[PDB]
C-alpha cells in the first residue's frame, strides 16, 4: 500500500469554527515565554476562540508546556520520561516543590497563571487529570521502547489520558470563570458528550498524524496501527473505520446534546458554555490540522481537498 485517503471528517462536522482575535499578540508573548528558557498557538486560537486575552495567553502557555513535555518524553526511555512527568506533576501539586530546572520554572509560571482565577473544583479536577496524564505518558514511553502495541480497549483508556485532551477540556472552567458542580460531571448524558468529543479529537488526530508517526517509528500510540493489527485490515480500511467511528460519535453528540437535564438557570447556562467549548475543540482541531505543515508537509493546504497521502509525493518532497 503506497497511498491512502483520509476520511472526510470535515464533511461530518455540523459545527462552525472560529479563531481567537488575541492570537497575534498573545501567541507572540507565549512564543517569547517558551524561548526564554507560532504553530502550536494556532491550535489554541482555533480551539479556544472565545477566550479572553489573559485566559487565552494561559491556554497558549499550557499547550506549549505540553508540547515541551511530549517532545522531551518521546525521546526518552520509560524511566526518564516518568522523571520528566514528575517534575511537571510535583511543581503542579506542591507549591513548595521546585528543583530549579527549566521545566519546573515553566510549570510554576503556568500554575501561578491558572491559580489567579481557577476555582476549587477546576483545580481539583485539573490536578487529577495531571496525575493521569503523567502516568499515561510514562507508560506510553515504556511501550514505545518495547515495541508493544496495545489492544484496542486498553489503547483508548491510555490514549484518552496521554492525549492531554482531559487537561484541555479541564481548562474550560478556568477560561469561562465558573466551577461546574460535581453532579454535572456525574450526569450520564453529559459524560456521553464529554467522551464523544474527547474521542473525536483523539481519533481525528491519530488518522492525521499516522503518516508522520510511522515515518518516525512512533506509530504504536495510534488507533490506525491498533485497528490494522487487531482487525487484520489494511491501511485504507483502517482509514475508513476511523471515518465511520468519527461520524458515529458525532451522531451521538448532536443527539445527546438535545437531552440534557436542567439543574438551575445559572448552572444550565454554564453547562451550555462548556458544550460549545467542546464543539469548538472538535472543529478547531480539524481545521488546524490542515493549516500546520507537521502532518501533511508543504502541500497541507491542498491535502485539505484531495485528502490523499502518497508515498511518491512524500519521496518527491524529501528529495
Show the cell assigned to 249.
Answer: 460519535
In angstroms, the CA 85 to CA 107 distance is: 11
Cited resolution, angstroms? 2.1
Provide the total of helices (H) and of strands (E) in the chain, helices listed first: 16, 2
In order of 161, 215, 266, 294, the CA distances from 139 in angstroms are 11, 22, 40, 25
Contact between residue 292 and residue 39 where contact means Cβ atoms under 8 Å apart: yes
In angstroms, the CA 46 to CA 59 distance is: 11
Contact between residue 161 and residue 135 where contact means Cβ atoms under 8 Å apart: yes
Looking at the DSSP bridge assignments, the partners of residue 137 are: none
CB neighbour list of residue 140: distance below 8 Å, 6 or more residues apart: 73, 81, 158, 162, 221
In order of 236, 291, 311, the CA distances from 107 in angstroms are 41, 28, 40
Contact between residue 234 and residue 1 where contact means Cβ atoms under 8 Å apart: yes
In angstroms, the CA 312 to CA 304 distance is: 18
Question: What length does the chain have?
Answer: 319
In angstroms, the CA 198 to CA 151 distance is: 19
Distance between terminal CA atoms of the chain? 21
CB neighbour list of residue 212: distance below 8 Å, 6 or more residues apart: 294, 295
In angstroms, the CA 198 to CA 203 distance is: 9
- What stretch of H or E contains 308? strand 308-310
Q: To which residue does cell 498557538 refer?
A: 41
In angstroms, the CA 40 to CA 27 distance is: 9
In order of 7, 171, 223, the CA distances from 245 in angstroms are 10, 26, 11
CB atoms within 10 A of CB 300: 16
Helix-helix angle 120-146:152-162, to 10 degrees: 130
Angle made by CA atoms 5, 44, 274, in degrees to the nearest 5: 100
Contact between residue 88 and residue 103 where contact means Cβ atoms under 8 Å apart: yes
Residue 297 region by backbone torsions, left for phi larger than 0, else alpha for psi between -120 and 50, else beta = left
CB neighbour list of residue 260: distance below 8 Å, 6 or more residues apart: 187, 189, 190, 193, 271, 275
Show the cell assigned to 103.
Answer: 521545566
Q: To which residue does cell 476562540 refer?
A: 49
Show the cell assigned to 286.
Answer: 480539524
Experimental method reported for this structure: X-ray
Contact between residue 176 and residue 275 where contact means Cβ atoms under 8 Å apart: no
CB atoms within 10 A of CB 276: 14
Contact between residue 202 and residue 163 where contact means Cβ atoms under 8 Å apart: yes
CB atoms within 10 A of CB 78: 16
Contact between residue 184 and residue 190 where contact means Cβ atoms under 8 Å apart: yes
Which of 14, 68, 4 minimizes the C-alpha distance to 234? Answer: 4
HEC profile for the chain? CCEEECCCCCCCCCCCCCCCCCHHHHHHHHHHHHHCCCCHHHHHHHHCCCCCHHHHHHHHHHHHHHHHHHHHHHCCCHHHHHHHHHHHHHHHHCCCCCCCCHHHHHHHHHHHHHHHHCCHHHHHHHHHHHHHHHHHHHHHHHHHHHCCCCCHHHHHHHHHHHCCHHHHHCCHHHHHCCCCCHHHHCCHHHHHHHHHHHHHHHHHHHHHHHHHHHHCCCCCCCHHHHHHHHHCCCHHHHHHHHHHHHHHHHHHHHHHHCCCCCCCHHHHHHHHHHHHHHHHHHHHHHHHHCCCCCCCCCCHHHHHHHCEEEHHHHHHHHC
Domains, the chain, ordered by start: 3-318 (1.10.600.10)
Which of 227, 63, 73 minimizes the C-alpha distance to 140? Answer: 73
Residue 234 region by backbone torsions, left for phi larger than 0, else alpha for psi between -120 and 50, else beta = beta
Q: To which residue does cell 471515518 refer?
A: 243
- Cα 73 to its chain centre, rounded Å, is 16
34-56 core/surface letters (b: 16 or more CB in 10 A; e: else): beeeeebbbbbbbbbbebeeebb
Residue 148 region by backbone torsions, left for phi larger than 0, else alpha for psi between -120 and 50, else beta = beta
Amino acid at each position: 500500500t503506497k497511498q491512502f485517503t483520509l476520511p472526510d471528517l470535515l464533511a461530518m462536522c455540523p459545527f462552525t469554527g472560529s479563531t481567537n482575535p488575541h492570537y497575534a499578540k498573545a501567541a507572540a508573548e507565549s512564543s517569547a515565554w517558551v524561548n526564554s528558557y507560532g504553530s502550536n498557538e494556532l491550535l489554541v486560537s482555533h480551539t479556544y476562540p472565545y477566550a479572553g486575552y489573559e485566559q487565552f495567553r494561559t491556554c497558549c502557555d499550557f499547550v506549549n508546556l505540553l508540547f515541551v513535555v511530549d517532545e522531551v518524553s518521546d525521546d526518552q526511555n520509560g524511566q526518564d520520561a516518568r522523571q520528566t512527568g514528575n517534575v511537571y506533576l510535583n511543581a503542579m501539586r506542591d507549591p513548595a516543590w521546585d528543583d530549579g530546572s527549566a521545566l519546573a520554572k515553566m510549570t510554576k509560571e503556568f500554575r501561578a497563571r491558572l491559580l489567579r482565577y481557577a476555582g476549587p473544583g477546576c483545580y481539583r479536577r485539573f490536578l487529577k487529570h495531571c496525575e493521569d496524564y503523567v502516568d499515561a505518558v510514562a507508560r506510553e514511553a515504556e511501550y514505545r521502547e518495547r515495541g508493544y502495541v496495545l489492544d484496542m480497549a486498553s489503547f483508548e483508556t491510555l490514549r484518552r489520558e496521554n492525549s492531554a485532551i482531559r487537561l484541555c477540556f479541564g481548562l474550560f472552567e478556568y477560561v469561562l470563570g465558573v466551577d461546574l458542580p460535581e453532579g454535572v460531571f456525574e450526569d450520564p448524558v453529559f459524560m456521553t458528550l464529554y467522551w464523544a468529543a474527547a474521542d473525536m479529537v483523539c481519533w481525528s488526530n491519530d488518522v492525521y498524524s499516522y503518516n508522520m508517526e510511522q515515518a518516525k517509528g512512533h506509530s504504536g500510540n495510534n488507533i490506525v496501527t491498533v485497528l490494522m493489527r487487531q482487525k487484520n485490515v489494511d491501511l485504507q480500511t483502517a482509514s475508513d473505520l476511523v471515518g465511520e467511528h468519527f461520524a458515529t460519535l458525532m451522531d451521538r453528540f448532536v443527539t445527546a446534546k438535545g437531552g440534557l437535564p436542567s439543574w438551575s438557570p445559572s448552572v444550565d447556562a454554564a453547562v451550555s458554555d462548556y458544550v460549545r467549548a467542546m464543539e469548538y475543540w472538535v472543529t478547531g482541531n480539524l481545521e488546524w490540522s490542515f493549516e500546520t505543515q507537521r502532518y501533511f508537509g508543504v502541500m497541507h493546504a491542498e491535502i485539505k481537498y484531495t485528502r490523499l497521502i502518497s508515498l511518491r509525493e512524500r519521496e518527491e518532497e524529501e528529495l
